[PDB]
Design an enzyme around this catalytic site. Structure first.
Site, PDB file in Angstrom:
ATOM      1  N   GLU A  35      -2.372 -12.037   3.662  1.00  0.00           N
ATOM      2  CA  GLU A  35      -1.567 -12.169   2.426  1.00  0.00           C
ATOM      3  C   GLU A  35      -1.970 -11.083   1.428  1.00  0.00           C
ATOM      4  O   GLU A  35      -1.064 -10.467   0.863  1.00  0.00           O
ATOM      5  CB  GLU A  35      -1.694 -13.566   1.823  1.00  0.00           C
ATOM      6  CG  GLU A  35      -0.934 -13.735   0.523  1.00  0.00           C
ATOM      7  CD  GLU A  35       0.519 -13.296   0.509  1.00  0.00           C
ATOM      8  OE1 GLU A  35       0.954 -12.751  -0.561  1.00  0.00           O
ATOM      9  OE2 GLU A  35       1.222 -13.506   1.563  1.00  0.00           O
ATOM     10  N   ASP A  66      -6.429  -1.173  -2.907  1.00  0.00           N
ATOM     11  CA  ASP A  66      -5.462  -0.061  -2.775  1.00  0.00           C
ATOM     12  C   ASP A  66      -5.730   0.973  -3.878  1.00  0.00           C
ATOM     13  O   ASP A  66      -6.464   0.700  -4.858  1.00  0.00           O
ATOM     14  CB  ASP A  66      -4.019  -0.589  -2.739  1.00  0.00           C
ATOM     15  CG  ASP A  66      -3.551  -1.191  -4.045  1.00  0.00           C
ATOM     16  OD1 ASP A  66      -3.719  -0.510  -5.089  1.00  0.00           O
ATOM     17  OD2 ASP A  66      -3.056  -2.364  -4.010  1.00  0.00           O
ATOM     18  N   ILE A  87       0.213 -13.288 -12.136  1.00  0.00           N
ATOM     19  CA  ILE A  87       0.404 -12.961 -10.693  1.00  0.00           C
ATOM     20  C   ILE A  87      -0.658 -13.671  -9.833  1.00  0.00           C
ATOM     21  O   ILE A  87      -0.346 -14.087  -8.710  1.00  0.00           O
ATOM     22  CB  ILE A  87       0.407 -11.428 -10.537  1.00  0.00           C
ATOM     23  CG1 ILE A  87       1.820 -10.923 -10.251  1.00  0.00           C
ATOM     24  CG2 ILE A  87      -0.572 -10.950  -9.483  1.00  0.00           C
ATOM     25  CD1 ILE A  87       2.625 -11.825  -9.357  1.00  0.00           C
TER      26      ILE A  87
HETATM   27  O1  LIG Z   1       3.534  -0.311 -12.705  1.00  0.00           O
HETATM   28  C1  LIG Z   1       4.318  -1.232 -12.410  1.00  0.00           C
HETATM   29  O2  LIG Z   1       5.452  -1.384 -12.946  1.00  0.00           O
HETATM   30  C2  LIG Z   1       3.876  -2.225 -11.360  1.00  0.00           C
HETATM   31  C3  LIG Z   1       4.588  -3.400 -11.114  1.00  0.00           C
HETATM   32  C4  LIG Z   1       4.184  -4.316 -10.174  1.00  0.00           C
HETATM   33  C5  LIG Z   1       3.031  -4.073  -9.447  1.00  0.00           C
HETATM   34  C6  LIG Z   1       2.315  -2.900  -9.662  1.00  0.00           C
HETATM   35  C7  LIG Z   1       2.716  -1.979 -10.620  1.00  0.00           C
HETATM   36  S1  LIG Z   1       0.931  -2.835  -8.607  1.00  0.00           S
HETATM   37  C8  LIG Z   1       1.292  -4.392  -7.968  1.00  0.00           C
HETATM   38  N1  LIG Z   1       0.625  -5.060  -7.068  1.00  0.00           N
HETATM   39  C9  LIG Z   1      -0.424  -4.474  -6.420  1.00  0.00           C
HETATM   40  O3  LIG Z   1      -0.748  -3.291  -6.588  1.00  0.00           O
HETATM   41  C10 LIG Z   1      -1.265  -5.326  -5.680  1.00  0.00           C
HETATM   42  C11 LIG Z   1      -1.334  -6.718  -5.634  1.00  0.00           C
HETATM   43  C12 LIG Z   1      -2.448  -7.023  -4.892  1.00  0.00           C
HETATM   44 BR1  LIG Z   1      -3.021  -8.742  -4.484  1.00  0.00          BR
HETATM   45  C13 LIG Z   1      -3.050  -5.858  -4.512  1.00  0.00           C
HETATM   46 BR2  LIG Z   1      -4.600  -5.609  -3.516  1.00  0.00          BR
HETATM   47  N2  LIG Z   1      -2.342  -4.829  -4.990  1.00  0.00           N
HETATM   48  N3  LIG Z   1       2.465  -4.841  -8.417  1.00  0.00           N
HETATM   49  C14 LIG Z   1       3.104  -6.008  -7.818  1.00  0.00           C
HETATM   50  C15 LIG Z   1       3.384  -7.033  -8.875  1.00  0.00           C
HETATM   51  C16 LIG Z   1       2.467  -7.203  -9.896  1.00  0.00           C
HETATM   52  C17 LIG Z   1       2.736  -8.087 -10.924  1.00  0.00           C
HETATM   53  C18 LIG Z   1       3.932  -8.771 -10.938  1.00  0.00           C
HETATM   54  C19 LIG Z   1       4.854  -8.602  -9.925  1.00  0.00           C
HETATM   55  C20 LIG Z   1       4.594  -7.709  -8.907  1.00  0.00           C
END
Ligand SMILES: O=C(O)c1ccc2c(c1)s/c(=N\C(=O)c1cc(Br)c(Br)[nH]1)n2Cc1ccccc1
Length: 195
Positions: A35, A66, A87
């Site tokens: 996950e 990452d 989140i």
């Molecule tokens: O910069 C933005 O607009 C943006 C948005 C969502 C987002 C990110 C960046 S990074 C990210 N998730 C990850 O990098 C991640 C989750 C996990 Br567990 C790991 Br390891 N890496 N997201 C996805 C997200 C974050 C918050 C709300 C909805 C989607």
């Protein structure tokens, strides 16, 4: 808000098989890693020449890192806490990393984004303090380290390198642009999957 979050996480601990799979035969335990890896792959794919690192620590916790954008840290207005906390804790924000947090005795989140390092600790999905700045960085990305709850996971409770390596080799093949590293700190075993 305060009580729905505690309830959503409680719902996951009440019916864990429905969320993560078998909690006794090692399926669920390794799904916890998968996950978080799926979130890191999804981020890696959003960018260019991204890398994911999966580490089995000597204490049988796993980290997934990452070098993507970093989970957003700004306050989410509905909840009045960091988007990252939402989140990690809100079930409705592909079951989501909130399931892993709910079923983890402890989870550590470190985000590198917009010049700052941010960190938050959870116990059984409960934040110990608001996400906080711990320093400066020009790196970007997300690191999640989790200690699975033995109040959920029975019998098979130790991570198996080969189970993680086989899935990560599949994910390397299916995502040919993504670098995947697997490191076992229990014995120094290390693999690099990059198609
Ligand atoms: O910069 C933005 O607009 C943006 C948005 C969502 C987002 C990110 C960046 S990074 C990210 N998730 C990850 O990098 C991640 C989750 C996990 Br567990 C790991 Br390891 N890496 N997201 C996805 C997200 C974050 C918050 C709300 C909805 C989607």
């Amino acid at each position: 808000s305060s009580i729905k979050v505690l309830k959503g996480l409680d719902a996951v601990r009440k019916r864990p098989g429905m969320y993560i799979g078998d909690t006794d035969d090692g399926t669920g335990l390794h799904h916890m890693v998968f996950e978080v890896v799926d979130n890191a792959i999804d981020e890696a794919l959003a960018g260019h020449c991204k890398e994911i690192i999966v580490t089995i620590h000597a204490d049988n916790s796993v980290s997934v890192q990452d070098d993507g954008r970093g989970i957003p840290t700004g306050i989410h207005p509905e909840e009045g806490v960091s988007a990252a906390e939402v989140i990690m804790t809100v079930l409705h924000a592909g079951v989501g990393v909130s399931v892993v947090n709910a079923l983890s005795q402890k989870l550590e989140l470190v985000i590198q984004r917009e010049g700052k390092i941010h960190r938050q600790i959870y116990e059984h999905g409960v934040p110990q303090a608001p996400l906080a700045v711990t320093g400066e960085t020009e790196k970007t990305g997300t690191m999640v380290r989790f200690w699975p709850s033995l109040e959920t996971f029975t019998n098979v409770t130790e991570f198996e390198y080969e189970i993680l390596a086989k899935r990560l080799r599949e994910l390397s093949f299916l995502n040919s642009g993504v670098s995947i590293r697997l490191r076992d700190k229990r014995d120094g075993k290390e693999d690099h999957f990059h198609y």
